Design a protein around this ligand. Structure first.
Ligand SMILES: CCN1C(=O)c2cccc3c(NS(=O)(=O)c4cc(Br)ccc4OC)ccc1c23
Length: 126
């Protein structure tokens, strides 16, 4: 069972820009989540080979991770903050779809999602 190619972190013809909200998302929101104790399983694409998860990409068809999100923010992949947030929401949702209520990884994702939502409320006005 091979790995799919990871999600793109740059695209010539996908519209993109910088906003102060996207700056906040990188320097504050992503940074704090990256540093959290529970971040590590979310810091790179699911390696279905070496983690022995042969069914992962059978269930999950739109994978996302914080490694991808960080690269995207650094490269200014996004048009707005809402597109980035959708990538975080995809990451969390994948975890909840693939796993079961109360699983270790699900409990970690909920803790990260709680901190994310808190950080998201203090997002600059423009
Ligand atoms: C967050 C992405 N992700 C999973 O949804 C998932 C499910 C099961 C194992 C692993 C996984 N393998 S692991 O060795 O880091 C792992 C972490 C935790 Br927390 C609990 C169990 C486990 O492997 C069995 C890495 C990333 C993910 C998963």
């Amino acid at each position: 069972g091979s790995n799919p190619p990871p999600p793109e972190t740059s695209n010539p013809n996908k519209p993109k820009r910088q906003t102060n909200q996207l700056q906040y998302l990188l320097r504050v929101v992503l940074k704090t989540l990256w540093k959290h104790q529970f971040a590590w399983p979310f810091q790179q694409p699911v390696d279905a080979v070496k983690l022995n998860l042969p069914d992962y990409y059978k269930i999950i068809k739109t994978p996302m991770d914080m490694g991808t999100i960080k690269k995207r923010l650094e490269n200014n992949y996004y048009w707005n903050a809402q597109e980035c947030i959708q990538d975080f929401n995809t990451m969390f949702t994948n975890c909840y779809i693939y796993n079961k209520p109360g699983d270790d990884i699900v409990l970690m994702a909920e803790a990260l999602e709680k901190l994310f939502l808190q950080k998201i409320n203090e997002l600059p006005t423009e």
